[PDB]
Amino acid sequence: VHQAISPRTLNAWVKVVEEKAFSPEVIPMFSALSEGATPQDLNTMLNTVGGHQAAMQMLKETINEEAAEWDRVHPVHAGPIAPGQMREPRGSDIAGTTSTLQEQIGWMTNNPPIPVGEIYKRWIILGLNKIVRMYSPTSILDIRQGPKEPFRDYVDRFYKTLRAEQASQEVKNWMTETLLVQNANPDCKTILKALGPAATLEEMMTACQGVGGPGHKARVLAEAMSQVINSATIM
Amino acid sequence: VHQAISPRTLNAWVKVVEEKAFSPEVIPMFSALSEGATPQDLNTMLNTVGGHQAAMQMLKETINEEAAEWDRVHPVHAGPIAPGQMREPRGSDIAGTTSTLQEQIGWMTNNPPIPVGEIYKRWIILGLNKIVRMYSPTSILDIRQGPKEPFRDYVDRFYKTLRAEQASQEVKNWMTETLLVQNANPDCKTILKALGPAATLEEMMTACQGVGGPGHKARVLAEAMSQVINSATIM
Amino acid sequence: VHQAISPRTLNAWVKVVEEKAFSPEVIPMFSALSEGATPQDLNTMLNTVGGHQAAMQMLKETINEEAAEWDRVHPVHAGPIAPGQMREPRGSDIAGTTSTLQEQIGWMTNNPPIPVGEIYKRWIILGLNKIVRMYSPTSILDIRQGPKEPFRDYVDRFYKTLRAEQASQEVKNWMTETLLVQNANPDCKTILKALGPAATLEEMMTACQGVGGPGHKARVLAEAMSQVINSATIM
Amino acid sequence: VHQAISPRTLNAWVKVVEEKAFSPEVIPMFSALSEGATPQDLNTMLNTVGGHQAAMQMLKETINEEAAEWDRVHPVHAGPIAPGQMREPRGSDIAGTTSTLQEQIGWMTNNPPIPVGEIYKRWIILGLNKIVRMYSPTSILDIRQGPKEPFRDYVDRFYKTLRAEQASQEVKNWMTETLLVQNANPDCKTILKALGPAATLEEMMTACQGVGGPGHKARVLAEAMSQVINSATIM
């Protein structure tokens, strides 16, 4: 006993990860909470992050790569001593893939003092740093209509990423009412907004379903043509 | 071993509690995740909720009250048998105040099968139901200016509750830009909005700092007076 | 056995208490259902009432006061007889605070016939009578706007007490549609009702948010001023 | 010996706390300076912060609450071994309330290695994080006059918080000369500023002592009335 991370600490960690979508100050809080911990608990803190799976790709990858390098530097020669402190850890197992919590303690407490946990900490910090450089948070605020994009697909992507937005209900609702219409292209906006704000996604879709199409194109063009053409001429 | 709640389950539970600010469907998910658990783990699931401390008042209170009633129904007579299955649980301890995890198991596994955990579950469900009836979620959307309220205090309350809003950074920023100005009273709005949208909280505060005051009152009134007075008369 | 109140009787009792919010005829039905019962069951019938906690203050208080008076009249001298019918009941315990169901029967059946249950009945009846005099039922129908009261607070109190109203869903809905608007002050009513009935609590709030404020005041006054001023004069 | 924090480290810590009124980057510097320390020294670092006592409320509170939870998880069973490593620490004493520096070392150095100091560190970090979310620094810059507020009280609050401002003398003086007058309401500003900048707080107070009062109100209103009334009429 007297080794085990408390659930409120893990909850604070997941709180910091959601509340900040990859800001550089994560490392302080991480090293602070994950203090003197054991590697197994460290994997616990890692896969418990929810969403943002994109970066987990790079994180997990830099982890295995450092593991490989520790392998390349460290030899497996050992023996033939009778079983005791069976071996040296291995880059495969310092991350806790092929080892038990038992072996991790039997490494930490036993002498020499091999701080495998600290080493795992070091690698993961390296990784998080590299992540902080190589990421870009996506928001609901960024989703914008392409210039030539069927409006229906636009809403479908809008909602697709909105469901992942981390907020309460009524927030999302009012978002759906203001930003979705606000962020469209001028072509479909000048028709979605002529139709008053009152009418639901169904009426909106049926209104702008024509954009990009030949009929609507011909009309818009013709209109612009005669808009300036008849300004200073007759017959 | 083979008794202990997994951290991802607790994380899902805190997720459901944040994601929904007291909707009636909490009970299903709660009873589902908290299945056959032990009471100690149940207190773990309870105090780990973050924020929304208002309801914890009523929840904790109905808990102790049911405990009292179980006391009033159940007698403490026992003995003088030698120590074994020392007693019956007590409404004080079924909730795990004066008992250890050890006694909870020594009650659950030992025969007769006293399902203390289930009873604690029953009480807490009762409580959550009563909560669902007696609560009202607060939002950022609701914060509105009183009719006679110094604008500065209005912003101070706005921010005060906003910091508790559960969203990412840029969300909050753009909220601060649209809703804060949008939700003011007509009197200070017709001055905050005459000053163009560009200018920061400092300029806004210095602009509406006069509302409610004698100078501004006299002016507004006078203006309204002569607005209609000079409409159909002269000299 | 052959002592225990049946659950449908208790259900009928809670039915009579909800269905009538403190009418004087409660005593008949109470004495009828609670016939020859035991005190423990009587406390069961008491704290099971739901809501209307206001009166429970006075009820519980008159109970402890009669208990005190029974103490003041009855002496605790007894002994040194060997244990049997250990003592006399006590005003602390006739109400069943420090006694078990066992002692209550060992008092009722044993001779002399001490009708402790009846005495508890007598006190509680006294109490309910005093309550019938000192209460006033609150309804949804009574909630009315103060003369100078921010409309938003008015709705907040409206809903606050409505959630406690004892009716089904659609009842409450249609109530919310008719009474809430119907019961406002003339000042905010003459603006809430100019805006057609169709528009939701949001539009209503934003409409009357100005009442009581300096702008709206100046306007209303000015208007009334010139309404009569220009009736019989010019220039 | 070879355990004791050096005074310049503590001085740097108080420097970082004053110099930054609750920015999120406190945690790095705190964990850095408070490295491997002992809990007693940690309480030393805590109560030595000066001013900003508001947050100490929340900090101290979250500390005792984590202590309670460690209690709820950890049992007090121990014995009957003869005195040696007398017990396990307790959530009451890990924070060093009922323990001596001696017991803290006899816990740290003795085996098993119980890192009580680290655990205290973990809790306090959790706390500081929660503080960073739940605080708002007050400045001298924020103090502003309410819209209807006796000017004299305005200056009294101004000075009241200014004496706590953390700067040298002449800074405060020139502040008192510029900001105090600059931040008043339009009504009293248009009189304080008509009286030239030269005259001291006494003359200023006697000048604006009339604001909000009936005389001054009547005058201001009348003035505004005839300001527009006589603009386009005569007789």
Residue numbers in the entry:
A (entry chain L), B (entry chain G), C (entry chain F), D (entry chain H): 143 to 377
Q: What does the paper behind this entry write?
A:
Gag is the structural precursor protein in HIV-1. It is a polyprotein synthesized from the unspliced viral mRNA, and is cleaved by the viral protease (PR) during the maturation stage of the replicative cycle into 6 proteins and peptides: matrix (MA), capsid (CA), spacer peptide 1 (SP1), nucleocapsid (NC), spacer peptide 2 (SP2) and p61. The CA and SP1 region multimerizes forming the immature viral lattice, comprised of interconnected hexamers. SP1, together with the last eight residues of CA, have been hypothesized to form a six-helix bundle responsible for the higher-order multimerization of Gag necessary for HIV particle assembly. A single amino acid mutation (T8I) in SP1 stabilizes the six-helix bundle, allowing to discern the entire CA-SP1 helix connecting to the NC domain.
We used two different Gag assemblies for structure analysis by cryoET: GagΔMAT8I protein assemblies expressed in E. coli and GagT8I VLPs produced in HEK293T cells. Upon iterative refinement, the final density maps of the Gag hexamer from GagΔMAT8I assemblies in the absence and presence of IP6 and GagT8I VLPs were obtained at 4.2 Å, 4.2 Å and 4.5 Å resolution, respectively. Overall, the refined models of GagΔMAT8I and GagT8I VLPs are very similar, with an RMSD of 0.36 Å. The GagT8I VLP subtomogram average shows a density that extends beyond the N-terminus of CA, where 5 residues in the junction region between MA and CA are resolved and modelled (bottom). Intriguingly, we observed a strong density above the six-helix bundle. This density is coordinated by two lysine rings formed by residues K158 and K227 (K290 and K359 in Gag amino acid numbering) near the bottom of the CACTD and above the bundle. A close inspection revealed that the profile and position of the internal density are different in the GagΔMAT8I and GagT8I VLPs maps (red arrows). IP6 is known to associate with the HIV-1 immature lattice and is present at cytoplasmic concentrations estimated at 20–50 nM in mammalian cells. When the same GagΔMAT8I assembly is incubated with a buffer containing 10 μM IP6, this internal density is present at lower position resembling that seen in GagT8I VLPs. The refined atomic model shows that the T8I mutation in SP1 stabilizes the Gag hexamer by enhancing the hydrophobicity in one face of the amphipathic CA-SP1 helix.
